[PDB]
Amino acid sequence: TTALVCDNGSGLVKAGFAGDDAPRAVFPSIVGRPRHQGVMVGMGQKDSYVGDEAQSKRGILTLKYPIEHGIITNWDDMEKIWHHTFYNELRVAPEEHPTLLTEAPLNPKANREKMTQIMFETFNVPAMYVAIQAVLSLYASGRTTGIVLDSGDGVTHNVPIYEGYALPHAIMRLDLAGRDLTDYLMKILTERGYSFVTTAEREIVRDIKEKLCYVALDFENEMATAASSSSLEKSYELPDGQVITIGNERFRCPETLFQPSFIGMESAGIHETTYNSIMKCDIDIRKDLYANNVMSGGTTMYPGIADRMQKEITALAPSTMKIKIIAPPERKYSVWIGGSILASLSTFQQMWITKQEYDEAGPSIVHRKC
Amino acid sequence: TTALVCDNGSGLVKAGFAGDDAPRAVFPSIVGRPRHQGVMVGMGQKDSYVGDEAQSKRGILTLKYPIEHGIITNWDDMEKIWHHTFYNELRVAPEEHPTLLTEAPLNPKANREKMTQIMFETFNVPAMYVAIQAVLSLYASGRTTGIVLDSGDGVTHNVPIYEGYALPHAIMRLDLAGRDLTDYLMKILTERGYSFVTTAEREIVRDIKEKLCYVALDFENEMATAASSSSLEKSYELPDGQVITIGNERFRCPETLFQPSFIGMESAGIHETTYNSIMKCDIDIRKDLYANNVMSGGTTMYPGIADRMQKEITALAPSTMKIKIIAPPERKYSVWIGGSILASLSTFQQMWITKQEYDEAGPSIVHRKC
Amino acid sequence: TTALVCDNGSGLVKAGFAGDDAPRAVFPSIVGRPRHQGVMVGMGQKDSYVGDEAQSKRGILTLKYPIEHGIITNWDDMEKIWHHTFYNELRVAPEEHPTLLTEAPLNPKANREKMTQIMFETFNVPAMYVAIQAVLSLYASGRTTGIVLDSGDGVTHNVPIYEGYALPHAIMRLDLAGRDLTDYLMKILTERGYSFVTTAEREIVRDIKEKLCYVALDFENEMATAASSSSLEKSYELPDGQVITIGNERFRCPETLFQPSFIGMESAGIHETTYNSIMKCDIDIRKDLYANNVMSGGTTMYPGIADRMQKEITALAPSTMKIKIIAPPERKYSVWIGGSILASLSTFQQMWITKQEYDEAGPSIVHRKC
């Protein structure tokens, strides 16, 4: 009876049963294949590896992400992620109970339809349902009104909601995300003499980005501080020894959000898109959105990002408007907890996309119901 | 008043006065030291030899390149190359007039700064200026728009430019270069029974690579042709007699560019990096870059490389886009002629890094001005 | 059904049936011919002698090695070694069951093909298979990951492997080997007044090298110790009486590995090639190779070579990397035990090169299958 959930993130897969506070299994969204010949006999060494198994053997594997900017490029590869998600990671049959999926807004219709075409034919779930990755965050926060900021590894949206009413006119999409931070972080390290120029070497640079980078509340003041003081310099032990030390690169890449002029994207910035999206709404709605600015998903773990975003929107926003940015510790999963909650609703049982309705209407049934 | 130029290539030094069509002196970027004891008395036989003098005595000298992948390893050695460049090769004082230098993009900041620290203290030029090796090629070609491919002995970059505006987001760097071709050429000859396993023996294999190798427009078709027909087999007279004959090895190594799977580098290839770099740019810019694909620097002398690259990008690129790859005969020096031109500009007189400004700001003055 | 194995070492022949822990027969890889006239009548005294029979009559025989640096010079001579290997040493027919062979990497294609041309025509085995001498060592050690050091009498390679994936980009070859140690040992003894200047006299110097030489963990400290203390001096009873005594020559020649400057080869050294080969690999692979550094083959029996190599790589390698060099007692045969294991695999039955496939494709079938 319980329906499982699969986030299908643009950089990380997060799946678990509904009504559960923590997910059962999480693994990176990667598929690798050998770039070297197999000398051994009776070694196994098959073609495809996914999840944390790929990181174990990444040295001799070239990693390609099947999901990119919330858009699926390799469909045969993404099919392997789901087979590994259910059978290998969770060890649960999909045919017994339905599944809940998530996807970023304004994606192409083919991704939204083809996603459904694979489930019922390959795995044959009893039913299915897709949901915008943003809306689930409210369920986790337990508030009807607010503006959500996903910041996943592929895309960020900045959609406002007012008492549960989504406004498609105010919704936004910006492709800047963690892979751009990693690709930019791989670039600026060239300055310090460290070179990471492969798929396997990318993952270490991503690992450096997680535990060591901060948002730099005051960029211009901190850059002058970095050159004068070496206190910010810290080291990370990449494999193969070769300790390293990053200084102003520690906080150069996360600034790409607030100003993407470094990477070259013609975008206003994360702070101004939330300012733009709120101004697209009616005048009466703006008060509650400033008071309820939900922060969710990955890329929001940089310490002080709530302080930078509160300091920044406050300058653009008018006085007398109280700005409170909700950055709970449980983010990086809040989209998932919304799925456990959204599947738990008894009302939600009507909204599933059953097998019998698919054969009648075809894969175009998603748009009218979802 | 005239300012000299020094390319400081990763495998070849090319220096001459500005406003000159041909360079005054060219010599390999090598420093050698004896690996045998000196039996003679009053023989000279000092420690260091550089340039073509080293090739003369290479039999009893172990050659180490001071510049490697556009990165300087032995600083005391590279100082000797410049002393030989000005005093011995050109016979010109550096203190009288300033000097123009070149360096590959995305190099570490230490190489970019330490390069400056040596000039003003050791040689004491009146001023200096550094420039990315790619931009100079446009000056030689006399066109504002285009995408450049240096292919020097150390590194290749593939940077696009649009009306003189460099885009750092689209720039690329790949360490595959001629030394990898030579090291790979030294490997595959083992197959034919020829063994070159020393620094001195490396130079003959490099000499074989220059005058005898071609790009093989159709690799798979030509390999089957090589086994069936012996017409492609030619001979080279290495010293010590011992004539040799290479067949499919004649064109096996330059294919490492288009597919580095042979040497094992996890890279897309030279054809696809130019395809990747152009796609990173805006949509309107792509038309002119396809029409203006400049080919410069060493490693581009393989006959038909313009045909292979035009044939290859045409398959990846969409129809209706005219692809014209500019491979002038004067390449292998086009970076230098840009230096003679770039120094000749009257506007350029403001952009020098003078001695008086160095003492005020220190060696960190390079980044803001250059 | 059982397939025999023949190592075909560059200085020693080692052959036996598969599934056997110890080889059936071992004999030196030498062919001798008389250098004196035959005065006796009805004496036999034919032209060729091989194996231990040659050492018995070496006084009046000039010994020439048919295999040299892993490369075959005298093909008619090497044919006699195999005829003696099967009929005389093992007393087993080759036509009944196939044979497994070994050969060092990066050998010329003629040796790799001509080796096959002789078997099916001369001996007419039912099938055959060639394998790189390095890979077999893993089968003996029973580990998928590691870096192997053959150190045979002809050549040393230093190839890394990662979960059974061989990397041709990281493989290395160095011709320094035991014959160079013997030829160098024959040289330095001239210093002590002992002269060994013939093929027969070479074998005694080789015998001296086996049981009496050590690696000298600290070279510079031990040389000063040798002059001060005569404890290291020991004697060996060569035939013809004439006892001898070697001091610092006892450990001078094995140092040629770590520094070949004595013999004059322009090589980095055995310690640094393993350091170079590992650095050619990906960053993630370096950890396991340091932990798994397999030591195999001849020339690795000098006491303490694991201590010298562990002490030496530790200086070059970075801290935090645990270095464990696996030097089992069963080495000098580990390449063979891999052959007994490799032939024992049921999967391996598909990989043979049968007689029927040879006539169809010719002797070029080796490269695609092997």
């Binding site: 003499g193 460290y194 070179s195 120029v197 070769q242 | 490697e68 992948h69 990165i71 230490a110 | 960053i283």
Partner: peptide, 7 residues
């Protein structure tokens, strides 16, 4: 190799 760390 020739970099301050990887290569």
């Amino acid at each position: 190799p020739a970099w301050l760390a990887t290569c």
